[PDB]
């Protein structure tokens, strides 16, 4: 059949996550950019939900691509731009999650420094820094995406060692360092809050930390797992066919974090909840 069952499952889950993420990110962006001003503790949510909104807006391109085979009858410059935009917003989201975790750790552990030297300008500066890091990381897909064959957006290969280099740098910088920093930061926050100061906050903080960590793990592990699994051995074997078949579901799960993020992050504060209720 033309539609593999994993393919249709990926298509339906991608459509559902696109709709849900578009709705949630639009609501969050509108309320946090109109109802309230950009204080110190809201710019992170603004940038995270903006990256997720860009991801959700670019996802229908992936919906349209996986229909018949993906001949991409759109042009040339878009073939060199759209994948770069998608990867840029996705890794901007993950780096913003890591930055949020680091900021929470800094708030809990160093209160005097945060009071005396941390404001809106520094938060905007570090957010610009992580955006620039994402752009630098996503330069290679921009310079290697083109309608090369065109008789198919084949990733330019002018297994080649550029492919190994790019997949290893993506795997490391997007799974190992960010996840480990997030885990360390939240573990330190929980350890510090084990004291008797945070009696009314230990339970909620532990729940939030476990929830965000497990959602990030479940959403992002299959992506890098199949990214490194399809690279090894001759794909003629059954394992290669299996990883090719499950790559669609893997990328769908990776994209689902975009719609999963705003509920877990933006809709957490009581004031933000009240503002969202009033706006709706």
């Amino acid at each position: 059949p033309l539609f593999q069952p994993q393919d249709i499952a990926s298509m339906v889950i991608l459509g559902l996550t696109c709709l849900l993420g578009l709705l949630g990110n639009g609501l969050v962006l509108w309320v946090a950019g109109v109802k309230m001003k950009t204080t110190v503790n809201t710019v992170w949510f603004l940038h995270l939900t903006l990256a997720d909104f860009l991801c959700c807006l670019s996802l229908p391109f992936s919906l349209a691509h996986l229909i018949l085979q993906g001949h991409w009858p759109y042009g040339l410059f878009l073939c060199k731009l759209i994948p770069s935009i998608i990867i840029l917003n996705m890794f901007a989201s993950v780096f913003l999650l890591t930055a949020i975790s680091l900021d929470r750790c800094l708030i809990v552990h160093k209160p005097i420094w945060c009071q005396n030297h941390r404001n809106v300008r520094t938060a905007f500066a570090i957010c610009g820094c992580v955006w620039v890091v994402a752009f630098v990381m996503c330069v290679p897909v921009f310079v290697y995406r083109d309608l090369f064959i065109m008789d198919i957006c084949r990733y330019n290969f002018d297994v080649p060692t550029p492919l190994m280099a790019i997949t290893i740098t993506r795997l490391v910088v997007g799974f190992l360092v960010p996840f480990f920093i997030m885990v360390i930061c939240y573990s330190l926050i929980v350890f510090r809050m084990r004291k008797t100061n945070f009696t009314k906050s230990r339970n909620k903080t532990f729940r939030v930390a476990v929830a965000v960590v497990t959602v990030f793990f479940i959403c992002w592990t299959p992506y890098h797992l199949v990214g490194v699994l399809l690279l090894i051995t001759d794909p003629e074997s059954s394992l290669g066919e299996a990883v090719m078949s499950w790559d669609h579901m893997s990328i769908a799960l990776a994209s689902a974090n975009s719609c999963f993020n705003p509920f877990l992050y933006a809709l957490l504060g009581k004031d933000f909840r009240k503002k969202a209720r009033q706006s709706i």
């Binding site: 670019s58 391109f61 992936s62 691509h65 996986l66 085979q69 993906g70 759209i82 994948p83 998608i86 990867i87 198919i152 957006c153 084949r154 990733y155 992506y223 990214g227 090719m244 078949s245 790559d247 669609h248 990328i251 990776a254 994209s255």
Partner: peptide, 10 residues
């Protein structure tokens, strides 16, 4: 053989 056809993700 080109089944995934370089998905928009990667």
């Amino acid at each position: 053989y080109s089944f995934k056809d370089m998905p928009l993700x990667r």
